[PDB]
A paper describes a structure:
For instance, [name] ([name], a member of five Plks), a validated anticancer target, has a unique exterior surface (polo-box domain, PBD) composed of charged, hydrophobic, and hydrophilic domains whose phosphorylation-dependent protein-protein interactions are crucial in regulating mitotic progression and cell proliferation. A large body of evidence suggests that PBD interacts with phosphoserine/phosphothreonine (pS/pT)-containing motifs, and directs the N-terminal catalytic activity to specific subcellular localizations. The polo-box domain consists of two different binding regions, such as the unique, broader pyrrolidine-binding pocket and the conserved, narrow, Tyr-rich hydrophobic channel, among the three Plk polo-box domains (Plks 1–3), respectively. The N-terminal Pro residue on PLHSpT is crucial in conferring specificity by docking its side chain into a unique hydrophobic core (hereafter called the pyrrolidine-binding pocket), which is surrounded by the Trp414, Phe535, and Arg516 residues.
Author numbering:
A (entry chain A): 372 to 499, 508 to 593
B (entry chain B): 3 to 8
């Protein structure tokens, strides 16, 4: 799911030692045309019993249940998409659905209501349907792999975040002050970047390796 | 954390 391409993109940038330049010109690597359309704006880890609930930046919500199935609710508040473990996609609505999905739909409603009333929305000041294919958490970050190939990594301690988009060969970095910047990885290789971002990109490569090994 | 940032 574009993971191999992303790995190669990261390897190239990391091997170029972006923070070891006579003059780092990170700003020259920005590319407004590569701004992502979708990213995870909120999430709730209730995997001890049900799964991982999350909200995308367009206000749609979704859940990757422990049984590896997914249920997505569009931002119109009624349209739904169910994805089986095998990837088989089915479409329905909150008002018209099979009884077999009643429980998962109720669970999604609970998740929606919660995230809607609580938590900050990541990338709120930025103007941009995939489902969550895979996710895992390390001791320092949560890794989210979307069906459109994007990989998002949220770092717990400093709240910085990376949204990797392999189709655009781009990466969006949200720093501690919530500054949202989108870069072309090829330009980061050419112009370099600060030590902090370089470190996050090295970590990202390792996280992509994990997604590939899973 | 068990949820994203508040
Ligand atoms: C999460 C993982 C470690 C860092 C921080 C605090 C605690 C230990 C729970 C988030």
């Amino acid at each position: 799911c574009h993971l191999s391409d992303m790995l190669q993109q990261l390897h190239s940038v990391n091997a170029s030692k972006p923070s070891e330049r006579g003059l780092v010109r990170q700003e020259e690597a920005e590319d407004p045309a590569c701004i992502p359309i979708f990213w995870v704006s909120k999430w709730v880890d209730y995997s001890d019993k049900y799964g991982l609930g999350y909200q995308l930046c367009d206000n749609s919500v979704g859940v990757l249940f422990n049984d590896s199935t997914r249920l997505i609710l569009y931002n119109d508040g009624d349209s739904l998409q169910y994805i089986e473990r095998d990837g088989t996609e089915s479409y329905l609505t909150v008002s018209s659905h099979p009884n077999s999905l009643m429980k998962k739909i109720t669970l999604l409603k609970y998740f929606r209501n919660y995230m809607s009333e609580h938590l900050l929305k990541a990338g709120a000041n930025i103007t941009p349907l995939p489902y969550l294919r895979t996710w895992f958490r390390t001791r320092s970050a949560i890794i989210l792999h979307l069906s459109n190939g994007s990989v998002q990594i949220n770092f717990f301690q400093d709240h910085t975040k990376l949204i990797l988009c392999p189709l655009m060969a781009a990466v969006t970095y949200i720093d501690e002050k919530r500054d949202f910047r989108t870069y072309r990885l090829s330009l980061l290789e050419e112009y370099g970047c600060c030590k902090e971002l370089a470190s996050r990109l090295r970590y990202a490569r390792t996280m992509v390796d994990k997604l590939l090994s899973s | 954390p068990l949820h994203s940032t508040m």
